[PDB]
Assembly symmetry: D2
Homo-oligomer: 218 residues x 4
């Protein structure tokens, strides 16, 4: 690397609403961007305790920490120091919908993420409002270039208490603030786990491993 | 009427983002709730001039002002003084998506609407970011009861400069803060027009007529 | 009228599959095209008794029989004698999806409709496979012109045994086989009722009233 | 293996419509089911030459030929000799929609696939009707168990002449005709290429490699 150190830290400032319930979150993270290893600690600074499952917010708390092979251009890393933004649509199988926007900037050895989250139509007796989810299954994002933007799609799935899954489709658009070398059709495999939290999830710790790769069968 | 005067006024406090662009709006309205007649004046108090078409925000600026026949229970009017909230999903044909939440309260002769708006994925060269829209075609909302909530669906369409239409599907969920007598399957026809505005739409005036009715052919 | 008599008859030849179950249907209809009045009798000629609700096929069994005011061009009636085709997408709220195609021709005083129906993903314990539906609520199709085609959208709803509704969104594209005068933004209100049928619905009679109109509130 | 030989052959009988255009196809295939290697030759027996891109039909022409590691139960292979069926929804980004149903049976050393294909709303000037597609990008199907069925989702993409991609989302439901041991959350990576064809694609040869695996990052 040259603009992004082998070891970095980052802060998260998130604000939003879920079925009209307002909230604010702040986080402190660290990781090895070139190793795709990452960890972060969140604090519900306002509106807590949250009346909904924390799992819907975990993926909103850091693309620069993705291990990219040398032969696959790293769209996000190249965007700095200028940075980039991302826009996300989350469609859950029971009708709930969330729109999420991020702005990722850099200052020295620290990344700063500002996030706006809007989710609604979560059924009152559903898995989210009843807090019956138990983390996301490891996932694989399909990525490709278009209009100078990187577009990602992921078939997510939340594990349910008592078995089964609660599906959600992800569509994320990454917009670099300056033109960069565009990558080819590829994927990013991820593992995201809550590694610690207090009783009402007003405090949470998350671990994430992200690795880019070319199609397995080609 | 008995809790809602024949002549009312209302204030709008709206905040939100469009493709990451933050903004704030305030409005002063008035109308005859039982006549379904209504008018409001908006001011872009923050983030202006807006880099996107005003038409996407016009429908977010007042259900109590809907003319309901006596034989059709008025879900929204019955909710007061307690009030109600509404959640809306707007799906545009070019992929843009907006989630909108409202809280409607009352104090004396004035209604207060607090609104959060989140819209994204509006193509940079699209009708919204290029401001090529010219108002909404009159519309007709299909409404029915479910789980004590009123659910509405509307096939909206924005007129385009040079002819043609830009489609958007509306889904609005109205949640009364107390149980009320639920209506049967019905519709609400509306006309919404911008009647005045300055050059950069930092100031706008809107007129709306809303009338409920039973199916035309039954 | 001039090419379409005040009193007409028509035949329906429908074939298709539902969750892989093949079937064939034939019908004899009659009505007053300019009065928007219509009736038809269907016979399940193959694959009966059908293991699914008849209601999903009722709307596939006649646009020429729609009452159009003189000041609103009748897209479909103008298409003859050449005729027209229509393509339809039906999205049910529990995930089921149907694609339907029609070809409407004319010979003397009789209309001939050839129909292909493909529906799948109807949950085994759902309202369709369990036959718990009780007819469609009267509906209102939003219609507008684009690319020389007429595009219609309808928020349909099937009544459920024991109360409640089973939602389905309709999108129908009408393609005239020759250019015609295009209508403006309008609606068509309809009432569709099964007026008779035997025990296993291998025989059915349907009545339909269709009337076009301009926006109610304009 | 025990019911499925190390070397198998298969026949394809496909029928369907695209924007109302009827067609029929027959194919002869062969491959090593346990090696996930497969090849097939198709012939447009009726309705040819097809006025649309062949690529939309290539994925409809054989799940038994998927290489499954020993520690991942093979849903499809276990279904035999009874067999299984599959239902598929294809949603293209320009609005086109296809519903596809299959029935897979076995007799000795040969598999027989009966297929019904229904596609419509393909824009006349789009990539499909104008035949501007150049094959599918290698893909990765997300698979999981539910209700005794195997459900798969894939973010497909067709390469376009002159660069760029034409997106399509796949959702396939595999229904075994008898209960079998259900697999865990996994993926199947595939490569599908047209290896030969005549000038108007009335004759086509396809090669496919399919390999199941557990999440890459777990």
């Amino acid at each position: 690397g040259g603009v992004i150190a082998t070891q970095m830290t980052y802060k998260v400032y998130m604000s939003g609403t879920v079925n009209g319930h307002y909230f604010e979150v702040e986080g402190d993270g660290k990781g090895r961007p070139y190793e795709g290893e990452q960890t972060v600690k969140l604090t519900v600074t306002k509106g807590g305790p949250l009346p909904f499952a924390w799992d819907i917010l975990s993926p909103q708390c850091s693309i620069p920490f993705t291990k990219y092979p040398e032969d696959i251009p790293d769209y996000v890393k190249q965007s700095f120091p200028e940075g980039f933004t991302w826009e996300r649509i989350m469609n859950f199988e029971d009708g709930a919908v969330c729109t999420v926007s991020n702005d990722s900037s850099i200052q020295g050895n620290c990344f700063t993420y500002h996030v706006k989250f809007s989710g609604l139509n979560f059924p009152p007796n559903g898995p989210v409002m009843q807090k019956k989810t138990q983390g996301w299954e490891p996932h694989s994002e399909r990525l490709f270039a278009r209009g100078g933007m990187l577009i990602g799609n992921n078939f997510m799935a939340l594990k349910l208490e008592g078995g089964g899954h609660y599906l959600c489709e992800f569509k994320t658009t990454y917009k670099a603030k300056k033109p960069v070398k565009m990558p080819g059709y590829h994927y990013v495999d991820r593992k995201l786990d809550v590694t610690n939290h207090n009783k009402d999830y007003t405090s949470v710790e998350q671990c994430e491993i992200s690795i880019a790769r070319k199609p397995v069968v080609a």
